[PDB]
Amino acid sequence: AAAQILMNMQGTANLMAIPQRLIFGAKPEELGINAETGQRMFDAYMARI
Amino acid sequence: SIDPEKLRDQLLDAFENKQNELKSSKAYYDAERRPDAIGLAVPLDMRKYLAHVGYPRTYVDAIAERQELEGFRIPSANGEEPESGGENDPASELWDWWQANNLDIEATLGHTDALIYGTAYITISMPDPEVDFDVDPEVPLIRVEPPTALYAEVDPRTRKVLYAIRAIYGADGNEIVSATLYLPDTTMTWLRAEGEWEAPTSTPHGLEMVPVIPISNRTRLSDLYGTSEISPELRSVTDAAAQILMNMQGTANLMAIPQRLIFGAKPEELGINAETGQRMFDAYMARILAFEGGEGAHAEQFSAAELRNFVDALDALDRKAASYSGLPPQYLSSSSDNPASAEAIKAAESRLVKKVERKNKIFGGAWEQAMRLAYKMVKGGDIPTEYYRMETVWRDPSTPTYAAKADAAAKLFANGAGLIPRERGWVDMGYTIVEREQMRQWLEQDQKQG
Amino acid sequence: SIDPEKLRDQLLDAFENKQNELKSSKAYYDAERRPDAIGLAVPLDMRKYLAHVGYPRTYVDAIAERQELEGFRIPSANGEEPESGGENDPASELWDWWQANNLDIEATLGHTDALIYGTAYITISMPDPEVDFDVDPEVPLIRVEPPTALYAEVDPRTRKVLYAIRAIYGADGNEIVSATLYLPDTTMTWLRAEGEWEAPTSTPHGLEMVPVIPISNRTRLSDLYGTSEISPELRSVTDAAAQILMNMQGTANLMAIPQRLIFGAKPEELGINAETGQRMFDAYMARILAFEGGEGAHAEQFSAAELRNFVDALDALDRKAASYSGLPPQYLSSSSDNPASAEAIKAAESRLVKKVERKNKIFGGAWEQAMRLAYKMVKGGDIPTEYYRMETVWRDPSTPTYAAKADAAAKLFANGAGLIPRERGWVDMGYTIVEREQMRQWLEQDQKQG
Amino acid sequence: RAEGEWEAPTSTPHGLEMVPVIPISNRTRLSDLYGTSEISPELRSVTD
């Protein structure tokens, strides 16, 4: 029983101990998503809006 | 039967195949990179920021740093001089060889390799003087050597070593610079001259059996070879905590601050530079940003990740790591109470003390056997049969409270009218077999003055 | 054999190749800039504000500052009754050379380099009269030299030194200004840089061995050469905590403030000076701003970052750094308690005490060996067989609870009617060999008066 | 240099074998050849 809890806690710490962030109603080509990879990099240093 | 040349080429392969399992125990004590310790949420370029975990180091050190040998005990039948430390005693010669070899330094090293890898090997010989050594030429050389340098084959019928190889893996791990083969009645040594062996140096010996003894970390009777003390439970918790540390450390670099957003705002109206996608704005504390809002525009945030959510798991794993290891609660789970008195100290140390008293029992057998081989090495023939009843004697593993024993021993002795003889009060105070002799000699001076 | 002319060049390359490894461990104790310490969220102009973390220095000092040498024990023939009187004992000679060299300073320095870099070396010679130094001409000159200034080759087979070399750099810069070879047969020295070398000054030598003894921080037998005390676990929490401190510092400069906004208010209506983008407004505390309200305008703000969120990770990394180091949890970020009793102090310090008692063993071996070489070099000829049983004696690493010992030693001795002889009470009170000597003179002088 | 550039020196022989100046130095370790400030880089960084 305790070994199952330690695995589920460790899985949770790798997948869900963190808020997951979503945007709705934004076109991927408006954001500038690269259609060949599905991603955009953004320079994310502190306090940038 | 088999020739030394073939038997060397056989044992060097077995010795080298052994290293493929020993590297898996070194990696936890040295804290090398382990794939299963890397926290999965961290992005691929940030996974260079490893977070090593010290439970295996802490646990193996906490056993080894409180094992301390003192003089061997040997019985005698109707013996006129049972007072251990006299000039003719079996106890005195074996302890003289212990000091002359510096085994009070070298054994405490060798017990770490015995705990980390599960075995280390004591070796016995007379010193060859042609090397111009700084050793006393009348004592046997006794040396303890690790499983990364010496390997021995044990027959499971007799539960004893048949033969063994030491391989000196040279400068910077490149090549075997020399090899030594131990057989029941002789020892051979070869050195690599360049790419190939020089002809063997050889030595016959008076022993009927090979001059090597395993200090084996036997956990259990059915554990034939001895096992690493860094058990699968503590391995799994060391890697579990390392993943929580990396995920927390990546979170603190990416989400411990909130992310700020604005929606419904045209970049070329905000004055965002088209070549670079940024606008600089001077942001000294109290300033207000006034915006156009023609869409019905508004500000938004993604929230910060709360780092306490990982510390909730770091606390839980420190309680599990403490519970599996049996260390006092403050070694690992230092978010716990601190022992206030000599009784509370005995309570907290109790499981670590009993762990070490059991390893004093197991490693005692290896040193007793090595001292019987050292006796036959120096003095030929059979051993006086009382040496088959010899015992190692070890310091108490508990933290030495002085005042709590001092007046307990004084109230038992009661100035010589009390419950115990003189020497028992010295043994219960924990004075060693070596220092009790010097106290006997000082007492026999004091009794001449008053 | 190899020419002394070549034996510089052949292993000054190895001396320089060593410096690339030593420089890594130095950066942690000297608290220098590391790529891994820089907090990633801080923007690239603010990344000049390095924060440094003192755990490596705190740990190395907490060991290095608690160990001190009281003297040597050499086992006498005909019983443990030696004295410093007429025809004085062996130990009072070796302690005179320890004092005459100020090794009570040079050792407490050299144990720090031995813990930082993993090794340091003890160099032995007679003093040269011709240089007019402040040294007694009759004692052996013994001094400790760091691995930043000296190197040695250790035989893989016997684990004893084959060759050694000093290199002394100029007062600034990378240029050598002197180099010295030690070999079994001789010591040789040069008094100019690489190129423009002087002719060899040379001294013939009395020992069968190189007069350079390594102090080495061997944790384990399979440490062949000793290892840095600043372990990878302690490096990991040092670099991890430095990132949390930089990200917290960036957050205090950028986000500990709520950022206030207005949407739907036209910059033209607010009277924004268009060529600067700013309006100053006279902002003493209680004033109320009033707006025409634009396109149905409203106020907004982005919330502040909680600096507490990073502090909850600083506390967790302090809790790990205490657990890996084995320091008493009053050091580092101090716990919610302090040990308020003489027993509770021994409960808190038990790990640090047992690690220092362990260092006192492995550094004792190097000092005992250096004292045998110093004797064999200054007296000439053979070593008396009792010097192979020589032991260092060191101070108790724990905080000296004088009153708790004084009650206990008094109850044990009981005015001479009690359990222990007088001198054992003096040993248990922790008086050094030189203090227990001088108390014999004062006790004999008191016995003239009664 | 009390009223212009250097006057001709006064002097005193002392006949010792060594210079009559001795450094007190805050030696942190053997490799710290000249000694270093007690206000260490970490204590500077937490102060700032």
mmCIF file of C-alpha atoms in Angstrom, chain B residues 435 438 442, chain C residues 68-74 82-84 89-96 99 391-396 423 426-441:
data_model
loop_
_atom_site.group_PDB
_atom_site.id
_atom_site.type_symbol
_atom_site.label_atom_id
_atom_site.label_comp_id
_atom_site.label_asym_id
_atom_site.label_seq_id
_atom_site.Cartn_x
_atom_site.Cartn_y
_atom_site.Cartn_z
ATOM 1 C CA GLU B 435 44.476 2.987 28.829
ATOM 2 C CA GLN B 438 48.395 2.840 32.215
ATOM 3 C CA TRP B 442 49.465 5.183 37.873
ATOM 4 C CA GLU C 68 44.555 20.556 17.227
ATOM 5 C CA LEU C 69 47.517 18.305 18.182
ATOM 6 C CA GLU C 70 48.470 17.865 21.896
ATOM 7 C CA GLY C 71 51.585 15.665 21.401
ATOM 8 C CA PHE C 72 52.842 12.148 20.521
ATOM 9 C CA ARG C 73 52.797 8.731 22.301
ATOM 10 C CA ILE C 74 55.768 6.374 21.735
ATOM 11 C CA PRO C 82 58.143 7.548 30.353
ATOM 12 C CA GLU C 83 58.951 11.149 31.502
ATOM 13 C CA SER C 84 60.453 14.501 30.290
ATOM 14 C CA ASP C 89 61.536 10.327 26.611
ATOM 15 C CA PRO C 90 61.191 10.094 22.762
ATOM 16 C CA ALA C 91 57.939 12.138 22.658
ATOM 17 C CA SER C 92 59.416 15.322 24.240
ATOM 18 C CA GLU C 93 62.023 15.448 21.399
ATOM 19 C CA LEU C 94 59.426 15.262 18.576
ATOM 20 C CA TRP C 95 57.246 17.880 20.306
ATOM 21 C CA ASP C 96 60.274 20.233 20.556
ATOM 22 C CA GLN C 99 57.136 23.829 18.428
ATOM 23 C CA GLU C 391 50.638 7.753 17.725
ATOM 24 C CA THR C 392 49.509 11.393 17.539
ATOM 25 C CA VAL C 393 47.258 12.669 20.390
ATOM 26 C CA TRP C 394 44.615 15.296 19.490
ATOM 27 C CA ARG C 395 42.185 17.596 21.385
ATOM 28 C CA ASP C 396 38.547 16.497 21.870
ATOM 29 C CA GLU C 423 46.450 11.472 36.386
ATOM 30 C CA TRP C 426 43.715 15.153 34.593
ATOM 31 C CA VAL C 427 43.290 13.312 31.231
ATOM 32 C CA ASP C 428 39.451 13.319 31.477
ATOM 33 C CA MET C 429 39.457 17.081 32.288
ATOM 34 C CA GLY C 430 41.184 17.462 28.861
ATOM 35 C CA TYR C 431 44.528 18.968 29.986
ATOM 36 C CA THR C 432 47.169 18.613 27.192
ATOM 37 C CA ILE C 433 50.487 16.671 27.606
ATOM 38 C CA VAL C 434 52.402 19.952 28.307
ATOM 39 C CA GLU C 435 49.810 21.018 30.943
ATOM 40 C CA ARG C 436 49.778 17.577 32.656
ATOM 41 C CA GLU C 437 53.577 17.882 32.744
ATOM 42 C CA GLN C 438 53.625 21.341 34.419
ATOM 43 C CA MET C 439 50.970 20.285 36.991
ATOM 44 C CA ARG C 440 53.508 17.711 38.363
ATOM 45 C CA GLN C 441 55.818 20.611 39.318
#
